Design a protein around this nucleic acid. Structure first.
Ligand code: MG
Ligand code: MG
Ligand code: MG
Ligand code: MG
Ligand code: MG
Ligand code: MG
Ligand code: MG
Ligand code: MG
Ligand code: MG
Ligand code: MG
Ligand code: MG
Ligand code: MG
Lengths: 163, 141, 176, 94, 38
RNA sequence: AGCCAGGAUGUUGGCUUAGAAGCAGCCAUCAUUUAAAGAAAGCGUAAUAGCUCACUGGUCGAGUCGGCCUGCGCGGAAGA
């Protein structure tokens, strides 16, 4: 390895992945298999790539003393074991879901997804981001307005009104 | 994917499928029928071409036969039909025997589109690079 | 040092009766238990037991740490109690228990009937498992040893009385 | 950095000399220049350290005598015939 | 066990203990490494 | 130091190879997957092996490692 120098290094880089970062996910990894790497790196073949890293650096004293890149509320985000997930290029969307549906398949605990940076706070996995470049959800979102929400109430009596 | 349950790989060439002398009672003895190893194989083997070595998983439960999901061949045998000698190493690094270049082996690395641990279409280049240097082959990149 | 310098925390329930150099602990279960010490000085106070050396003794610490651990296992002793478990292997084995004396069949020309000691009882949930709880860690460990002894595990097929924490190497016989 | 403190020898000869290395010291000398040569005793384990650093034989060295800084170069060193210790050291007023 | 006058640990699972006045090697993997008189 | 994890993919590498898919064998030891993972440690295989090691993360929380110069002891050590 090395000393204080190797230390700072991993941080400034790992933490520039939080400064220049598109997104951030904190996932405790008890019982982490190599299949684990074989996943976020498989979901990197034909859907991601090297635009993502996830260095288990719960070195804390490291990854944390080294977020003077402005990462408050992360002392609370420093408990137990974690595997920092940081985005550089691409949207912040897809990356979150990957773990969301990984850990839910068992694939090691997800630290109840303690949440992370970008919005900046605590725990509560949302779905803002992943619904993007699927704007056909805004095609289906208009709900035909005048027509679909029509053929559902203005036209739902007959199929349920002759009682 | 899971882990372990049943799978091996012991063949010579697709040119002569389901051989007897080379493997025989060794091609499978756990749930694999020696005669049933010429039906699901050639169903896709004779479907593209025969010649190159083709190993494969041997997913075996307890339902009579077996199910093998095949993929890619050894990128090392691609030096007997698409490079030079009928052999390979023989005389490794005591003399500059064979020599390939950057040009060749390109579309050889291109075929394995579902068999490469490197999303970087460029990184998965130096991987087969060694697969053509395990016998004493210099590279004229 | 270390193990010695550690606490002990007398769980709300244990009597902790320090009479000079004699400590007696009773609680929940377990017929009390009361051992002795020597170069170690023990101190009660608060909700714990502290263990330290004693000037003039080079045994110190070393005698003190074993004090800790011992005393430690004495608390827990009467608290949770103590584990066990052995399984018999090989056709025609099997154990019994029928009181406080276990009857063993191990392929001799005779049963064995081993008689449990004081503060330790055991049951045979199965023909081939002996599980023996007790307070005195030092004693279960024995009766286990003592039992397993009638027929330690041969290293060829594995027949004999194992623990469960077993490892049984087992090897092939000389070639022909 | 090579700074070594010593004391002017009150005795000399194999007698006192063997009493030095006995009490974890050792004899030294300092000659050169128009200044008359000097009887010096150094601490073993101290200097034993400075001599392992290959820098000890190339860079000038500084000697403190009752507090008077001499500074010389490591002319010659006598080692033990079979142990890792110093026997005696010559020093030149350079 | 071996009663050599030099004991030496051999494997990595070989221990080296003094029980009574006697140095011994205790190997957990291989019993051929068991030794006394050291 | 324990204890919790992990230890792949090109690559079953080709090879004097009956069969060799890391370890009686030859020579090679290069490049990826990433926090680490050696064509390389061990048991030992009909051949797969199954299960475990260097090396990295976690827990814990103050020391820990091996040489050097020296003092005193242990084994080595059986006889009428
Ligand atoms: Mg670290
Ligand atoms: Mg005179
Ligand atoms: Mg004399
Ligand atoms: Mg004895
Ligand atoms: Mg540690
Ligand atoms: Mg482990
Ligand atoms: Mg093989
Ligand atoms: Mg080989
Ligand atoms: Mg082998
Ligand atoms: Mg790293
Ligand atoms: Mg280690
Ligand atoms: Mg001596």
């Amino acid at each position: 390895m090395a000393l204080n120098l190797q230390d700072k290094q991993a941080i400034v880089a790992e933490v520039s992945e939080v400064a220049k970062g598109a997104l951030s996910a904190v996932v405790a990894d008890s019982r982490g298999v190599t299949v684990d790497k074989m996943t976020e790196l498989r979901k990197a073949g034909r859907e991601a790539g090297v635009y993502m890293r996830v260095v288990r650096n719960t070195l804390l004293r490291r990854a944390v003393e080294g977020t003077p890149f402005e990462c408050l509320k992360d002392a609370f985000v420093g408990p137990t074991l974690i595997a920092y997930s940081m985005e550089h290029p691409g949207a912040a969307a897809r990356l979150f879901k990957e773990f969301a549906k990984a850990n839910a398949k068992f694939e090691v605990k997800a630290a109840a997804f303690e949440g992370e940076l970008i919005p900046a706070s605590q725990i509560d996995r949302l779905a803002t981001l992943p619904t993007y470049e699927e704007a056909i959800a805004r095609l289906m979102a208009t709900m035909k307005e005048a027509s679909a929400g029509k053929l559902v109430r203005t036209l739902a009596a007959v199929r349920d009104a002759k009682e | 994917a899971k882990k372990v349950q049943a799978y091996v790989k012991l063949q010579v060439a697709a040119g002569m499928a389901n051989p007897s002398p080379p493997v025989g009672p060794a091609l499978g003895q756990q749930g694999v029928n020696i005669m049933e190893f010429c039906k699901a194989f050639n169903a896709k083997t004779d479907s593209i071409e025969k010649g190159l070595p083709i190993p494969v998983v041997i997913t075996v439960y307890a339902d009579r036969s077996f199910t093998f999901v095949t993929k890619t061949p050894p990128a090392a045998v691609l030096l007997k039909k698409a490079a030079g000698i009928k052999s390979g190493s023989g005389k490794p690094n005591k003399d500059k025997v064979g020599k390939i270049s950057r040009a060749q082996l390109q579309e050889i690395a291109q075929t394995k589109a579902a068999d490469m641990t490197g999303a970087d279409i460029e990184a998965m280049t130096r991987s087969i690079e060694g697969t053509a240097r395990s016998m004493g082959l210099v590279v004229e990149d | 040092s270390r193990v010695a310098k550690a606490p002990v925390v007398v769980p709300a329930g244990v009597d902790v009766k320090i009479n000079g150099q004699v400590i007696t602990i009773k609680g929940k279960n377990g017929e009390l238990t009361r051992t002795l010490n020597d170069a170690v000085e023990v101190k009660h106070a608060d909700n714990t037991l502290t263990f330290g050396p004693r000037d003039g003794y080079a045994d110190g610490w070393a005698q003190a740490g074993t004090a800790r651990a011992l005393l430690n296992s004495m608390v827990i002793g009467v608290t949770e109690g103590f584990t066990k478990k052995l399984q018999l292997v090989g056709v025609g084995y099997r154990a019994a228990v029928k009181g406080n004396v276990i009857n063993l069949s191990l392929g001799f020309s005779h049963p064995v009937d081993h008689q449990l000691p004081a503060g330790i009882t055991a049951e045979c949930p199965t023909q081939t498992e002996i599980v023996l709880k007790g307070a005195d860690k030092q004693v279960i460990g024995q009766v286990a040893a003592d039992l397993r002894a009638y027929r330690r595990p041969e290293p060829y097929k594995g027949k004999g009385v194992r623990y469960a924490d077993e490892v049984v190497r087992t090897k092939e016989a000389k070639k022909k | 950095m090579f700074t070594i403190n010593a004391e002017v020898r009150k005795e000399q000869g194999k007698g006192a000399s063997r009493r030095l290395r006995a009490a974890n010291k050792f004899p030294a000398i300092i000659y050169g220049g128009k200044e008359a040569p000097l009887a010096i005793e150094l601490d073993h384990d101290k200097v034993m350290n400075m001599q392992a650093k290959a820098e000890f034989y190339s860079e000038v060295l500084t000697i403190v005598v009752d507090g008077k800084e001499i500074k010389v170069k490591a002319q010659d060193v006598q080692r033990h015939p079979y142990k890792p210790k110093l026997q005696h050291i010559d020093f030149v007023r350079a | 066990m071996k009663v050599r006058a030099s004991v030496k640990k051999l494997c990595r699972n070989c221990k080296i203990v003094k029980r009574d006045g006697v140095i011994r090697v205790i190997c957990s993997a291989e019993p051929k490494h068991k030794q006394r008189q050291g």
